Design a protein around this nucleic acid. Structure first.
Ligand SMILES: Nc1ncnc2c1ncn2[C@@H]1O[C@H](COP(=O)(O)O)[C@@H](O)[C@H]1O
Ligand SMILES: Nc1ncnc2c1ncn2[C@@H]1O[C@H](COP(=O)(O)O)[C@@H](O)[C@H]1O
Ligand SMILES: [Mg+2]
Lengths: 576, 456, 576, 99
DNA sequence: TAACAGCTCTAACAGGAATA
RNA sequence: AUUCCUGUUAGAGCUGUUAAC
DNA sequence: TAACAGCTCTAACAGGAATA
RNA sequence: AUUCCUGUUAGAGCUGUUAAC
């Protein structure tokens, strides 16, 4: 069974679903696994008799692990990761002292190293929002007891072997959600973790597994098998009428590495008429992340704790401009709402198709797709005939900043509109390179008075500079002053970015003048750049950057006209 | 910076009437359709009784005759509608009392009034009711008249005769419609006739009209207080009223005390929790145990931290609570422009601050003009030239100014005791204030709860 | 022992404090008490045999309660609220069926009717933030468990009778916080609630309590005795060396109604050398509220859940002004920061003292206390000699709105400053009524051209009106047009409130002209009021309310000058 | 997806009855047994570990008038450890009215 | 999955030297 | 590759917005 | 606890009637 | 008190800000 079909089946019926988390899931919770516990026990055992400093040598080192394992093999102990080893080393270290064994197992799996990850939190959310009612576990630490307390804010009813008959009563009286630990909490005296204790099953809990088998279908994750008592309890649960109404979904991180016991149990279950399926869904964390993703109408209150990254942190406010102040190149566009034109097409259209129609027709208007057009209707009639046009109406953009941030098409459209507006009534030529718009001093009109201030900006030692011309050592390359103008969405504001550049008349032959572009820009220091930016502000706006609110409209003689207003003074902020 | 958040004018709430018909004009709908509760026979017939001195009984029978016959409006004809006669308009006969259903006040009442003793005068008026109490089954509403010669005991410090009479006859279950000489000498007649007739119908049976578009799952709560000037200090007597539309057809409107001594009008944790507990227990009893889903607690003063905590902890998480404070006197006032001849449309709410809004419970109302249809009407044109809005300072809510504003607007129109079109405050606040006056006058009323028809 | 001294004693040593809460806290948690349980049982019992509709008659009615109690007394059952009644009615209804008894007690005290109040949440916060470590309870429902799960977000370790000895070990290994129910959860077979079960104590829980006695001191609340086993356990705990290092604080809601058993136990404890004290602190909720109030450095994360009212809800944002628009009387003061003067006094001063110094000296400056003065230093030298003045410096109010909102002295000072500024250069007279300021047309200069527009505002049918004069039927009362001007702090903004009024020249003789004030104001409808407000805006500002930002400074010829800027257009907002 | 109203018409209900017996207890009224198919149905439903957890209640108008098979099944269930009971009530409609 | 818009990065080259 | 990052020429990667399949 | 500042309420009176 | 809330005259109640005790 493929994982996606399993997800659809679960999503199809997750209301009635017992979970059977093994010790594998707690692997991520940060709790030491079974192998980590074994290696810790070996470390204590070796350091104790052979008097060696405990903290001097670590445990996850390869050399120390090999040395300790060689020592263990020297005394005839089991060789490597073999059965009857974990219980063997426990009973060796603690020499049949179940109180001390319990205390150590509590300390190793204590509730201070546990850091809940997405898997346990998602399962606890499923418990609270009441899709899964029974969560059986062979695991001791409160990995899921804590997650439920953190998410729901309510105490979770954990069941264990100290009572062990609570689960059957709670199941019978429908006191969901129930979280019955088949091997009980470590706080209590009976833990049932050694191999001799792992051959028997508690009568009342075993009874509960069978009664819960009929009510729900089982999904077991992070369980590798290797336990005889749980395997025989599951087999007995299979051997009864309508054993699983929703099928036993045994999930493993890897089907190839799954133990043969799981596969033969699945085959036996299939032979007993139930629809048990073995699937691979990767790790438990990824499985539960996907399951939560497919969950519909998850409450916001619990989802604010399930996925803390989903909520937006670091909303740290900025202080006031009170009390040297950098002067950036950002002109704030205080326009909040604009009007655009919409055309309805009888057939669906593609933004590429509209772009090629722009290239062919070359109208005196702007258009984009989302089809929002800015300009005159007759231009659109030239672009689109009456047959393909259903209606032409109006569009209002109440929040320009949110609109451009949401859709990049709106960003490009508004950038092109403001660029056309700024260069509508001025002699400065408008070009494009890559997707950046450039306002460049024209070659012929370089002697204008409105450029003279710019001529002062580039001048050396206060004399008259040059604005346009030919490269010193180029055959045909022509150069001019220019400004790259862009639209930047910052927070909830829109700004115009101006950057002084040296435009080259041939587009593809810019690199041949690189040295010149370098040479002309070697000494454009803070004062010179300040002067050039002021001159460009004056050219583009017509007013000096003091207390100005110049307003510019694109296509003023058109029915659909966009009227922007940009402060003539660039952004500044005095130091605190 | 002078452009504020866009407001939206909540339309005039519809009022459920006879045969579930809706009309936002109360009196026009009453003339056209009839009372909402007249669909069932809660009042079989409005049997009246008189209690007055022998000299002034003629005024009582004359005013009853005036109620019997139709009358035409003389003042405020912009809003009022021609009376159609009690039998025609409320579809229930108005029975004039017989000889034994018509009592006479003791002449000792005159001596007490000359002595200027309000307490003894109220006691004597109540004691005069025994002749009718032997026939309590006979009548439904008692019209107690007070001659002008008793003015010396009508209202003075530490006392109020009307509240004392209402609190003395409330446990005796007989509704009482007090009539002063003012109702007689008011210039217009249709005014007094409409007011008295709607009061009489409400006190004998109930529900002259019911507000439509009312979710059965919301219980609205209003707290209001009054002051008893003690010799040493003061006593702040606060009481709470509750309105809700139950599963049954009978819309419910009750009030109750809040218990000992209070030095300030702010309830503590325990008192707020106890009052809120009584409130939702009443709702559950009227809703066969179903939990309320929306709770509105309107208070004339700001909720302290203790009150908000008590609200939060009294209910469960499933019942969202809308803690709102109502401010009557505010500096702001608006003027509608298109400038309009008539003031801003009633019900416009203007969000000023994330927690504070202006609500225009006063203002021009559309669609209720009798003469020159289509012209707006300003209810308080005689009193004020402009409408003074109120401030809603939400102290606890999840979202939506419209949800609370529309509820307040609809709660400003179901005051059956109010003759006019609407009220500046929700009926919850006005009834809580009336019951606060009653309890302040008679402290031994804290035991029981009472329906609106007793004190309106 | 008075309650305040008990609070101080508890706050002094709060790190070593066991709590004891039996059946008294549950009263305030939204769950039925012992008497409520008894009455519910009587209701079921009466309705069962005598066939009566269960829902037809309630249980908290007085008549039905009396009828059911009379029926119970008819069959010879115990009379009224007497011992061996609660257990008697339980054993009568359930005829020795402990499973059904447990199920009913679970349903009555289930975790759906419980709504945590301040007391349980505060105790759970004390548990989490680790002041109290042991919380013993004779109570079954999981109120404290749910409170801890809601606040801490961590699973709480509840101890009961099933495990029994689990709690003692936790105490020995310092696995705090521990919440040991002396009578155990209802989720388990043994509940120990009937009187026959209430005579014995579990051996291990008894030992745990005896051991916990030495470590901490006990505070017992919501407990009224009447239990023999708990009383004898406490008495045995007293009869041991250093039984309570911090004293047994027995708290009751009322000392007068306390049972004599508690008092004699307190006397016995005092005779055994411990400092046990009985105090009255009101209800459990108020006690814990005060205790939390006295708690220092409470973490913000848990306190955001302890007192949900402390955080500010209903921060519902307001929409844009997009798309009839009311025109209010509020002029926005866009000034954000102002400068003031500060004088340092050699001796402490009172705001009343400064006010009387203002009344006597009558300087040409403004002063307030917080002493912030606005105006010229020589005026302050007239008010205060050199001996009482230490230094004179400057003050900056970076956030005017927050400053006026925080301190009402700042509100009054800024209101007076803006009023003086607005009437500094204008002939309109400045008066005060109560605590408000009035700008009134002067009597002599009523023929000014700047008043002519106002003359148009009051005119009838477009003719010339009247602005100042004498009342129609008053001996000496003089009347004029005026505007009440105030400062309103709204959110994070400051506004100027203008309200048209009819000023009366004698202050105390205003009421005699009331009818006139009514008569003049009978027909000041929306159009007329609009005209008067526009005329007053023009008079007070000199510019019509279109796109204006008039700036006014008070004492421009003074070293300490306040320069405000108020938009000339009142607040408006188009409808959505 | 409750509620369902299934008629035995006495194997497609056999598994349903078994699962339902696993889920919650049963009260049977208006039936005297006498049918071996449903008899074996119920006897097979009893065997599992948690069968009729709340209890099995065979209600008859009169205890002594009931067929011997019903009492035999009740005794067998009680021996098996289940909490089956035989209670005497009135007519089924009267019993349901009193409930 | 196929285009299209923006924001940002690296992958190859080339390239001159700290206010003159 | 003693360093530095200034540009040029390209492609990807993410987001999106449509059309689908 | 004594003043002082504002915001808001009720407690007693008085009082006239829906754009003229 | 058939109603309505417009004002007048007062006092409190909360918040604060200081000085304390
Ligand atoms: N991401 C995972 N989450 C939970 N269990 C896992 C995960 N990956 C592997 N496992 C299982 O954990 C088991 C090891 O448990 P143990 O036998 O106690 O060492 C193996 O059988 C694995 O299949
Ligand atoms: N709010 C409360 N705070 C503290 N103690 C309480 C509270 N309510 C009741 N009690 C005490 O709890 C006792 C009743 O407990 P019991 O009758 O033993 O279940 C009463 O005698 C009261 O003294
Ligand atoms: Mg009345």
């Amino acid at each position: 069974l493929t994982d996606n079909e399993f997800y659809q089946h679960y999503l199809q019926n997750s209301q009635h679903m017992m979970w059977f988390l093994g010790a594998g899931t707690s692997r991520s919770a940060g709790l030491p696994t079974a192998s980590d516990i074994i290696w810790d026990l070996k470390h204590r055992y070796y350091c104790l008799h052979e008097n060696q400093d405990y903290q001097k040598h670590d445990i996850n080192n390869h050399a120390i692990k090999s040395k300790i394992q060689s020592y263990m093999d020297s005394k005839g102990f089991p060789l490597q990761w073999s059965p009857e080893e974990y219980s063997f080393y426990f009973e060796l270290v603690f020499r049949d002292d179940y109180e001390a064994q319990r205390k150590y197992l509590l300390e190793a799996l204590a509730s201070r190293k546990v850091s809940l990850n997405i898997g346990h939190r998602v399962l606890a959310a499923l418990l609270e929002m009441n899709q899964t009612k029974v969560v059986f576990t062979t695991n001791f630490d409160d990995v899921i007891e804590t997650a439920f307390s953190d998410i729901s804010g309510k105490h979770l009813s954990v069941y264990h072997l100290e009572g062990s008959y609570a689960a059957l009563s709670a199941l019978n009286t429908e006191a969901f959600p129930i979280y019955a630990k088949i091997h009980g909490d470590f706080r209590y005296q009976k833990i049932k973790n050694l191999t001799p204790d792992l051959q028997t099953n508690d009568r009342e809990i075993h009874k509960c597994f069978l009664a819960a088998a009929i009510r729900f279908g089982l999904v077991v994750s992070g369980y590798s098998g290797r336990d005889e008592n749980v395997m025989t309890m599951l087999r007995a649960a299979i051997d009864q009428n309508n054993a699983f109404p929703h099928g036993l979904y045994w999930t493993v991180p890897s089907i190839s590495k799954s133990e043969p016991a799981v596969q033969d149990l699945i085959t036996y279950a299939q032979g007993k008429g139930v629809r048990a399926y073995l699937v691979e869904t990767g790790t438990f964390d990824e499985m539960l992340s996907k399951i939560w993703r497919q969950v519909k109408d998850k409450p916001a209150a619990i989802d604010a704790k399930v996925r803390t990254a989903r909520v937006c942190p670091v909303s740290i406010p900025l202080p006031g401009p009170g009390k040297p102040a950098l002067r950036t190149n950002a002109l704030p566009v205080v326009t909040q709402s604009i009007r655009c034109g919409v055309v309805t097409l009888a057939s669906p259209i593609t933004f590429s198709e509209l772009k090629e129609r722009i290239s062919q027709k070359s109208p005196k208007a702007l258009l984009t797709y989302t089809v929002l057009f800015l300009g005159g209707e007759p231009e659109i009639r030239k672009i689109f005939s009456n047959d393909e046009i259903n209606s032409i109406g109006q569009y209002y953009i109440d929040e320009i900043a949110q609109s451009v941030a949401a859709s990049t098409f709106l960003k490009s459209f508004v950038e092109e509109a403001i660029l056309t507006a700024l260069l509508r009534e001025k002699p400065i030529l408008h070009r494009v390179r890559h997707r950046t718009h450039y306002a460049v001093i024209p070659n012929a009109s370089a002697k204008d008075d409105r450029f003279l201030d710019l001529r002062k900006a580039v001048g050396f030692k206060g004399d008259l500079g040059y604005i346009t011309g030919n490269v010193t050592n180029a055959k045909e390359l022509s150069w001019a002053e220019a400004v790259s103008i862009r639209l930047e969405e910052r927070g909830g504001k829109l700004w115009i970015m101006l950057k002084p550049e040296i435009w080259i008349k041939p587009l593809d032959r810019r690199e041949e003048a690189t040295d010149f572009i370098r040479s002309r820009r070697r000494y454009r220091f803070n004062q010179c750049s300040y002067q050039i930016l002021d001159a460009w502000i004056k050219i583009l706006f017509g007013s000096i950057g003091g207390g100005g609110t110049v307003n510019i409209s694109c296509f003023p003689d058109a029915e659909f006209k966009a009227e922007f207003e940009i402060g003539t003074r660039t952004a500044f902020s005095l130091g605190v | 910076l002078s452009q504020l958040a866009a407001h939206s004018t909540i339309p005039e709430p519809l009022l459920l009437f006879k045969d579930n018909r809706t009309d936002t004009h109360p009196l026009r709908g009453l003339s056209q359709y009839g009372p909402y509760s007249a669909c069932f026979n809660l009042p079989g017939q409005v049997r009246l009784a008189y209690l007055a001195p022998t000299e002034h009984m003629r005024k009582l029978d004359a005013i009853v005759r005036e109620l019997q016959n139709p009358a035409t409006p003389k003042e405020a004809t912009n809003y009022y509608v021609e009376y159609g006669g009690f039998e025609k308009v409320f579809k229930v006969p108005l029975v004039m009392p017989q000889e034994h259903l018509r009592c006479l006040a003791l002449d000792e009442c005159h001596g007490v009034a000359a002595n200027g003793n309000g307490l003894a005068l109220a006691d004597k008026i109540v004691q005069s009711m025994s002749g009718l109490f032997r026939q309590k089954h006979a009548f439904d509403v008692l019209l107690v008249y007070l001659p002008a010669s008793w003015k010396k005991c009508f209202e003075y410090d530490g006392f109020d005769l009307h509240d004392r009479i209402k609190a003395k006859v409330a446990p005796l279950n007989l509704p009482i419609q007090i009539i002063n000489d003012t109702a007689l000498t008011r210039q217009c007649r249709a005014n007094v006739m409409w007011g008295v007739s709607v009061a009489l119908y409400a006190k004998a049976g109930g529900i002259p009209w019911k507000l439509a578009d009312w979710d059965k799952d919301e219980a609205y709560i209003g707290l209001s207080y009054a002051i008893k000037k003690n010799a040493e200090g003061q006593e702040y007597t606060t009481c709470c009223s509750q309105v809700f539309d139950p599963d049954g057809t009978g819309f419910e409107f009750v009030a109750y005390d809040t218990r000992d001594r209070k030095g300030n009008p702010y309830l503590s944790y325990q008192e707020m929790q106890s009052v809120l507990s009584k409130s939702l227990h009443l709702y559950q009893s009227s809703h066969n145990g179903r939990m309320p889903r929306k709770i509105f607690i309107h208070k004339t003063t700001h909720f302290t931290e203790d009150e908000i905590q008590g609200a939060f902890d009294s209910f469960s998480s499933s019942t969202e609570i809308e803690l709102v404070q109502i401010i009557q006197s505010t500096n702001w006032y608006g003027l509608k422009v298109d400038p309009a001849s008539y003031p801003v449309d009633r019900g416009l709410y203007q969000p000023l601050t994330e927690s504070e809004c202006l609500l225009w419970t006063q203002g021009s109302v559309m669609g209720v003009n009798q003469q020159n249809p289509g012209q707006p009407v300003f209810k308080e044109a005689a009193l004020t030239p402009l409408p003074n809005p109120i401030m809603l300072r939400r102290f606890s809510g999840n979202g939506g100014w419209h949800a609370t504003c529309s509820s307040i607007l609809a709660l400003t129109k179901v005051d059956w005791n109010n003759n006019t079109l609407y009220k500046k405050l929700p009926v919850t606040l006005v009834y809580s204030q009336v019951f606060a006056d009653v309890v302040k006058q008679t402290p031994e009323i804290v035991n029981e709860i009472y329906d609106y028809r007793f004190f309106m």
